[PDB]
């Protein structure tokens, strides 16, 4: 995280490690990701036509 940002947050549950941060000049900024951590890239198909079919 490029610069309450050096402290953990309850949104870190299952996303990044709240128990291991590099101490020093980058304490709390650089965060190690969790083991079961994934990311999203893109939805190639439009979901509006699938959203209008549910009510």
């Amino acid at each position: 995280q490029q610069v309450d940002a050096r402290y953990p947050h309850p949104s870190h549950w299952g996303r990044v490690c709240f128990l291991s941060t590099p101490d020093g000049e980058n304490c709390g900024l650089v965060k190690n990701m969790s083991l079961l951590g994934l990311v999203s890239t893109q939805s190639l198909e439009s979901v509006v036509e699938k959203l209008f079919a549910c009510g």
Binding site: D4, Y7, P8, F18, L19, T21, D23, G24, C27
Partner: protein, 124 residues
């Protein structure tokens, strides 16, 4: 910080939507919290992941390595003011810049009165 502790540190306290851990509990919203939590477990029986998160938040402030320039610059600016004060042969406490007077006699808390060549300001 911007979050509080739910006073239970259990699994049901983490999933509470009206808990101070999430954010504004709605009692009108909340903006800041001072974290306060008591851990019923110990370091022998094992901690809960919520209790470990609470301990990590409360112990993150002890490992930062910041604001460390204060005891360096304070010691430097205190030594530049005091490194030239010494004890004269006449019995007075003189400065080095022009032999200017600082104290007339030393304090009577010590029995050894043979401090007539020591730099008292440096050791002070």
């Amino acid at each position: 910080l911007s979050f509080g502790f739910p006073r239970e540190l259990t699994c049901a306290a983490w999933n509470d939507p009206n808990s101070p851990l999430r954010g504004a509990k709605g009692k009108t919203t909340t903006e800041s919290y001072v974290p306060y939590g008591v851990i019923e477990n110990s370091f022998l029986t094992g901690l809960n992941p919520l209790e470990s998160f609470v301990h990590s938040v409360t112990s993150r402030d002890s490992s930062f390595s910041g604001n460390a320039d204060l005891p360096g610059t304070l010691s430097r600016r205190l030594m530049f003011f005091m490194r030239d004060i010494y004890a004269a042969y006449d019995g007075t406490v003189r400065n080095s810049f022009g032999n200017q007077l600082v104290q007339f006699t030393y304090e009577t808390d010590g029995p050894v009165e043979d401090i007539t060549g020591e730099a008292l300001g440096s050791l002070s």
